[PDB]
Swiss-Prot record:
Places the protein is found: Nucleus membrane; Nucleus speckle; Cytoplasm; Nucleus, PML body
Keyword set, alphabetical order: Acetylation, Cell membrane, Chromosomal rearrangement, Cytoplasm, Host-virus interaction, Isopeptide bond, Membrane, Nucleus, Phosphoprotein, Ubl conjugation, Ubl conjugation pathway
Domain Ubiquitin-like: 20-97
PTM field: Cleavage of precursor form by SENP1 or SENP2 is necessary for function.
Disease: Non-syndromic orofacial cleft 10: A birth defect consisting of cleft lips with or without cleft palate. Cleft lips are associated with cleft palate in two-third of cases. A cleft lip can occur on one or both sides and range in severity from a simple notch in the upper lip to a complete opening in the lip extending into the floor of the nostril and involving the upper gum.
Family of this protein: Belongs to the ubiquitin family. SUMO subfamily.
Pfam families: Rad60-SLD (PF11976)
Organism field: Homo sapiens (Human)
Primary localisation category: nucleus
Domain of life, per lineage: Eukaryota
Identification of the protein by name: Small ubiquitin-related modifier 1
Length: 97
């Protein structure tokens, strides 16, 4: 009973069962278009972390901005309606956050 009868395909599938995924690209002075198919309901704190990981710096280093507005990290990208933007940039956290 303890051993499963078969391994499921849930971790193995990649299409999220024909579900939606984010297409937003964050492109700072790093000049790279690295982005992943995560769901649109995550908070920007995790993206802040993942971008700082592409530079090898802690998450307190950078904040995102687009249309002139730097944004607060507890938003989700669907709150801001930005889930497929061609470019959002980063700028340094001048005094941290």
């Amino acid at each position: 009973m303890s051993d499963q009868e078969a391994k499921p395909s849930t971790e193995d599938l990649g299409d999220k069962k024909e579900g939606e995924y984010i297409k937003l690209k964050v492109i700072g002075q790093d000049s790279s278009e690295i982005h992943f198919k995560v769901k649109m309901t995550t908070h920007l704190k995790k993206l802040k972390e993942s971008y700082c990981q592409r530079q090898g710096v802690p998450m307190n280093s950078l904040r995102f901005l687009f249309e002139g507005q730097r944004i607060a990290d507890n938003h989700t990208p669907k709150e801001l309606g930005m889930e497929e933007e061609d470019v959002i940039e980063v700028y340094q956290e001048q005094t941290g956050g």
